[PDB]
Design a protein around this ligand. Structure first.
Ligand SMILES: [Mg+2]
Ligand SMILES: [Mg+2]
Ligand SMILES: [Mg+2]
Ligand SMILES: [Mg+2]
Ligand SMILES: [Mg+2]
Ligand SMILES: [Mg+2]
Ligand SMILES: [Mg+2]
Ligand SMILES: [Mg+2]
Ligand SMILES: [Mg+2]
Ligand SMILES: [Mg+2]
Ligand SMILES: [Mg+2]
Ligand SMILES: [Mg+2]
Ligand SMILES: [Mg+2]
Ligand SMILES: [Mg+2]
Ligand SMILES: [Mg+2]
Ligand SMILES: [Mg+2]
Ligand SMILES: [Mg+2]
Ligand SMILES: [Mg+2]
Ligand SMILES: [Mg+2]
Ligand SMILES: [Mg+2]
Ligand SMILES: [Mg+2]
Ligand SMILES: [Mg+2]
Ligand SMILES: [Mg+2]
Ligand SMILES: [Mg+2]
Ligand SMILES: [Mg+2]
Ligand SMILES: [Mg+2]
Ligand SMILES: [Mg+2]
Ligand SMILES: [Mg+2]
Ligand SMILES: [Mg+2]
Ligand SMILES: [Mg+2]
Ligand SMILES: [Mg+2]
Ligand SMILES: [Mg+2]
Ligand SMILES: [Mg+2]
Ligand SMILES: [Mg+2]
Ligand SMILES: [Mg+2]
Ligand SMILES: [Mg+2]
Ligand SMILES: [Mg+2]
Ligand SMILES: [Mg+2]
Ligand SMILES: [Mg+2]
Ligand SMILES: [Mg+2]
Ligand SMILES: [Mg+2]
Ligand SMILES: [Mg+2]
Ligand SMILES: [Mg+2]
Ligand SMILES: [Mg+2]
Ligand SMILES: [Mg+2]
Ligand SMILES: [Mg+2]
Ligand SMILES: [Mg+2]
Ligand SMILES: [Mg+2]
Ligand SMILES: [Mg+2]
Ligand SMILES: [Mg+2]
Ligand SMILES: [Mg+2]
Ligand SMILES: [Mg+2]
Lengths: 50, 113, 117, 101, 207
RNA sequence: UGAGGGAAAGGUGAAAAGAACCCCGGGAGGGGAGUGAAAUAGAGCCUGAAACCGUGGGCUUACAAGCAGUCACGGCCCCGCAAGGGGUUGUGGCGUGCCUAUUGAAGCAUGAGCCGGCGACUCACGGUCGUGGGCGAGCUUAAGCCGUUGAGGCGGAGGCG
RNA sequence: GGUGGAGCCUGGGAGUGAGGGCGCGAGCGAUAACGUCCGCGUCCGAGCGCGGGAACAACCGAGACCGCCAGCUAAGGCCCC
RNA sequence: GGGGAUGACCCCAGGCGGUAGGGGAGCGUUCCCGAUGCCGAUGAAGGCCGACCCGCGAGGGCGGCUGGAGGUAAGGGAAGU
């Protein structure tokens, strides 16, 4: 109505996915990477499309 | 009332004061005076003087009938340690912790008289 | 908008540390040893909760087999009358008539001994 | 006049005084529901059937209270799996008036 | 969203009921209001949070310990996230938060908050300052007869630089510029007061 | 040597009104008295946690074997009018610390003495996909200009189809 | 026949590419290896959660949502722990 | 799937071990709109407890002691979370 009553549509906020956080209950130590390898180390997977 | 004063900044390690405090508890004031008169340690000079100060505060400021009192609780805490430097070999130094102690003792009445 | 930690990990360590009381030594005072015990205390608290029923049954078989034996029949003879005679009443939770007041449990032995054939 | 009532799978040695807790019934807290199947009459009466077929108890419930909090915790070694789940099992407390029949 | 408006009758002219299809009843939604509120409070941010990362601390790239045969942990310089006086890796940098909403989104927001002030009938359009020469005491002694006691927040917007000047200091009212009208002040307030100049330039803006 | 490296260290009280004075004590240190809303607000003195060191009370341990716990029975003590609850384990039963790396760890593989604090998946410019909106064969602004200095419009060079 | 966390197409998103045990069909080995490498299946990995095998991941049973002082069973046992 | 008062409340059937992962729903911290407002010496943030209440939870309320002046709804956003 005036303010603090207008609100977004409840479908698209997505909560940022906050990937590297607590070990259980979500996504643990490795964020989305493997245990070891090129994709696991920093700045790897050198050139995916080529 | 339970008469104490304090001891603060005594410059002695507490573990070598608990040996001369934990045996004089329960005895009377003159008994602890004569035990700490002849107890050949360094802490006995600092606990004997705080028993003279504590008994002297019990007889004067709180009129507790000095013949009729003994040591109720006597304990010594740890104060701020001095972090000096003791140089060992091969150039590497070790910090040394010359500590200080808090020798407090309250004075208990014998019984309700 | 710097969001430092502050209060939330002190409250989080107080929750585990005050949840873990009555433990030997540093695993009741230190926080890195309190949560290593409460994990095993939770797993033992689950498995022994599963084990309490079976352990009470293993007590109940000893009480029923102990009480029925002097009448002239053991446990395997006793249950065969109950499963066949349609007198499934005892069901091993009723050991307190074999312990408390046996003048009716002896009549249950009288109903069980005639049900062998 | 004791009995052995059966409700929720469990059975109970019941007295005309009172008893312990049972399953969460669909009972109004002021109403009085019947616990149907019993066993083993008190003074000189004994049965040899699963149901007495003639005697039963009618017991008034008190209310759906709040019990203790059983806290379960799944933990697995070197799997990185930590679960902390709370659980409270409901109860209905009820007295006994008499065992008629 | 309503034909009915509230007229002042300053001297002689009676109460009129003006109209346009942006304030005639149609479809409205709060999400398009929220987008202009969030953008309005989003380009408002100056963005001056700045921390030294590892590349520009006032430290030196010198190895404190040798790599092996020492005993302690391996380190490379004082300027790291470890050795806590060093800089944080991903601290905030001064960046621009501006992004342009489409024009039809913006005019369909400004033509919708005023529609929210028209469906309730809370707006009250005037002609000019009906009092004398525009003071604060001489403005409260006109809004009191206009029905504005101060128990609710009012947004007045006019082309006169003297009604704004007299009404600048009251805590219950907020005053603006006629071409400086936005959505968010109408969002903060709940009663819109303007003239035929702010309404006129408002309808030149709303196509 | 030098080029150079490079710290930690804020908080009494509204007002020092910073404890006159008596006593013990060489002094330090206090005990009283007094000022003070508060003196565990006493001079590196606001709040003052945890590790750590003690003192006093309840329980239990000198014939019992364990990653130290969980469950059960009982005894003792303390709350509550009672129902019930809280601390302890004498015994029984069951039980191979956490994480990493691994085909595989309680591992006689690595890291951790304990506590408190710092810290690790963002951002600029773009591409792809999905989602919430606006418009629709159209959509759309950049640089810059005009406005109070927390207010917006102007501005089709341009881009996609 | 088969409505099932069955399938088929498109798009987004990872991880894996050191495996191992067991039974069978095999090669090398010495018809030796808890040895190496394939295939057919299972299990562990990822079910070091449970019962038995004294203890033990792959030998057997069984696929743990939680709770109860309820029963029936699978493998294995019924002299006592 | 149904009663479809569309019930976002109850019935029926099936399912609910799990690493690397994929997805969904929430809690807490700093600051901001709400805020020229509200709470606060009859006591705010913080510290020590609770055998109290709610929640499958990160936790949130309420009661007691200390403390002496700040904290901030509901509905949302930006992260040095
Ligand atoms: Mg990889
Ligand atoms: Mg790793
Ligand atoms: Mg690898
Ligand atoms: Mg690198
Ligand atoms: Mg000092
Ligand atoms: Mg030298
Ligand atoms: Mg079972
Ligand atoms: Mg284990
Ligand atoms: Mg594993
Ligand atoms: Mg260099
Ligand atoms: Mg550098
Ligand atoms: Mg070392
Ligand atoms: Mg710095
Ligand atoms: Mg005074
Ligand atoms: Mg003082
Ligand atoms: Mg004083
Ligand atoms: Mg102190
Ligand atoms: Mg000091
Ligand atoms: Mg202050
Ligand atoms: Mg202090
Ligand atoms: Mg002691
Ligand atoms: Mg012996
Ligand atoms: Mg003994
Ligand atoms: Mg034990
Ligand atoms: Mg970890
Ligand atoms: Mg692995
Ligand atoms: Mg080790
Ligand atoms: Mg070892
Ligand atoms: Mg290694
Ligand atoms: Mg080591
Ligand atoms: Mg599948
Ligand atoms: Mg490979
Ligand atoms: Mg390979
Ligand atoms: Mg292979
Ligand atoms: Mg092999
Ligand atoms: Mg072989
Ligand atoms: Mg499997
Ligand atoms: Mg094992
Ligand atoms: Mg076994
Ligand atoms: Mg197994
Ligand atoms: Mg299952
Ligand atoms: Mg059987
Ligand atoms: Mg149902
Ligand atoms: Mg079923
Ligand atoms: Mg699951
Ligand atoms: Mg995962
Ligand atoms: Mg801050
Ligand atoms: Mg007030
Ligand atoms: Mg108070
Ligand atoms: Mg704060
Ligand atoms: Mg205090
Ligand atoms: Mg951070």
């Amino acid at each position: 109505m005036k303010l603090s009553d207008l609100r977004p549509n409840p479908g698209a906020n997505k909560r940022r996915k906050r990937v590297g956080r607590g070990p259980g209950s979500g996504h643990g130590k490795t964020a989305t990477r493997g245990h070891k390898g090129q994709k696991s180390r920093s700045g790897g997977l050198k050139d995916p499309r080529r | 009332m339970e008469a104490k004063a304090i001891a603060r900044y005594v410059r002695i390690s507490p573990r070598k004061v608990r040996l001369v405090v934990d045996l004089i508890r329960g005895k009377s004031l003159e008994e602890a005076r004569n035990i700490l008169r002849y107890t050949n340690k360094r802490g006995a000079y600092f606990v004997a003087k705080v028993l003279e100060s504590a008994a002297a505060n019990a007889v004067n400021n709180h009129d507790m009938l000095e013949d009729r009192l003994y040591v109720k609780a006597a304990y010594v805490d740890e104060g701020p340690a001095l972090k000096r430097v003791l140089p060992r070999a091969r150039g590497r130094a070790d910090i040394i912790k010359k500590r200080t102690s808090h020798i407090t003792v309250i004075l208990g009445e014998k019984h309700g008289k | 908008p710097r969001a430092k930690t502050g209060v939330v990990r002190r409250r989080k360590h107080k929750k585990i540390l005050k949840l873990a009381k009555g433990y030997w030594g540093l695993r009741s005072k230190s926080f890195r040893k309190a949560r290593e015990t409460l994990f095993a205390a939770g797993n033992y608290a689950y498995a022994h909760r599963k084990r309490r029923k079976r352990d009470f049954r293993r007590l109940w078989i000893v009480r029923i087999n102990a009480a029925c034996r002097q009448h002239g029949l053991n446990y395997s003879t006793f249950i065969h009358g109950l499963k066949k005679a349609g007198i499934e009443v005892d069901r091993k939770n009723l050991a307190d008539l074999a312990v408390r007041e046996p003048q009716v449990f002896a009549e249950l032995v009288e109903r069980a001994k005639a049900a062998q054939g | 006049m004791f009995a052995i009532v059966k409700t929720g799978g469990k059975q109970y040695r019941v007295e005309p005084g009172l008893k312990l807790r049972v399953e969460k019934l669909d009972a109004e807290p002021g109403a009085t529901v019947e616990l149907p199947v019993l066993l083993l009459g008190g003074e000189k009466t004994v049965v040899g059937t699963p149901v007495v077929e003639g005697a039963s108890v009618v017991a008034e419930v008190l209310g759906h209270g709040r019990g203790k909090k059983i806290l379960v915790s799944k933990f697995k070694a070197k799997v990185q799996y930590r679960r902390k789940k709370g659980h409270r099992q409901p109860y209905t407390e009820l007295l006994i008036k008499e065992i008629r029949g | 969203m309503k034909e009915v408006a509230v007229y002042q009758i300053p001297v002689l002219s009676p109460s009129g009921r003006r109209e346009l299809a942006a304030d005639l009843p149609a479809e409205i939604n709060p999400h398009l209001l929220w987008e202009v509120v969030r953008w309005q409070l989003a380009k408002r941010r100056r963005g001056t949070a700045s921390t030294k990362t590892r590349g520009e601390v006032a430290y030196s790239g010198r190895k404190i310990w040798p790599q092996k045969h020492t005993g302690r942990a391996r380190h490379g310089d004082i300027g790291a996230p470890i050795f806590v006086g060093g800089g944080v890796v991903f601290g905030p940098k001064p960046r621009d938060y501006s992004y342009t909403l489409p024009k039809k989104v913006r005019k369909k927001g400004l033509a919708m908050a005023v529609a929210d002030r028209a469906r309730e009938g809370k707006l009250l359009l005037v002609e000019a300052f009906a009092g004398v020469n525009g003071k604060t005491k001489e403005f409260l002694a006109w809004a009191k007869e206009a029905g504005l006691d101060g128990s609710e927040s009012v947004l007045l917007v006019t082309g006169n630089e003297l009604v704004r000047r007299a009404a600048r200091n009251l805590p219950w009212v907020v005053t603006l510029a006629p071409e400086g009208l936005n959505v968010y002040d109408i969002v903060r307030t709940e009663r819109l007061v303007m003239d035929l100049d702010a309404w006129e330039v408002f309808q030149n803006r709303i196509g």
